[PDB]
Design a protein that fits this description.
It is classed as viral protein. The entry lists the keywords phage structure, cryo-EM, protein assembly, viral protein. Cryo-EM structure of Mycobacteriophage Douge genome-free connector (gp5, gp9, gp10, gp12 and gp13). Chains A, B are Protal Protein (gp5). This is part of a larger assembly, with two copies of chain A (39 residues). Chain A is built from one helix and no strands. By secondary structure, chain A is an all-alpha fold. Chain A starts with a helix and ends with a helix.
């Protein structure tokens, strides 16, 4: 039970981390295309 | 209960860290576009 609780809290922690990383990557790609399209 | 409290305090810690990282990335992108638009 203790290991399952720790695994669940971890799993949501890395799920939030992965979502944040994906959002950051999307924002970086948007910034890159915005700065590259200008000419 | 202890594991849930630790998970909650961690979760807010990495949420603040991700928000700070996103703000830093936005500031860096703004600085890059400002320094590149000058010609």
């Amino acid at each position: 039970q203790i290991i399952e609780a720790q695994g669940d809290v971890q799993k949501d922690l890395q799920d939030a981390q992965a979502k944040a990383q994906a959002d950051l990557a999307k924002q970086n790609a948007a910034a890159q295309q915005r700065q590259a399209v200008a000419v």
